[PDB]
């Protein structure tokens, strides 16, 4: 309902490219997303560390 709201990518949405944790909508795509336009505070940091997400 909040934060978590995607599972593909910021711009290149094909098949979840960001395995980053999923509590802060960070399942976008490690390469073009960084709280720049998906719903996160300049996250760009804990990308490699994720909690309960799908990953790739």
Q: Residue 1 Cβ, how far from Zn ion at the closest point, in Å?
A: 16
Count of residues making up the chain: 56
* Least gap, CB of 18 to Zn ion (angstroms): 8
Q: Which of 9, 16, 20, 8 is nearest to 52 (CA)?
A: 20
18 binds Zn ion (CB under 5 A): no
* Interface with Zn ion (CB under 5 A), residue from 4, 8, 32, 44: 32
List binding-site positions.
9, 12, 24, 26, 29, 32, 40, 43
């Amino acid at each position: 309902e909040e934060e978590f709201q995607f599972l593909r990518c910021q711009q290149c949405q094909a098949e979840a490219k960001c395995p980053k944790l999923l509590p802060c909508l960070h399942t976008l795509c490690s390469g073009c997303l960084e709280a720049s336009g998906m719903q996160c505070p300049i996250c760009q940091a804990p990308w490699p560390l994720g909690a309960d997400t799908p990953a790739l």
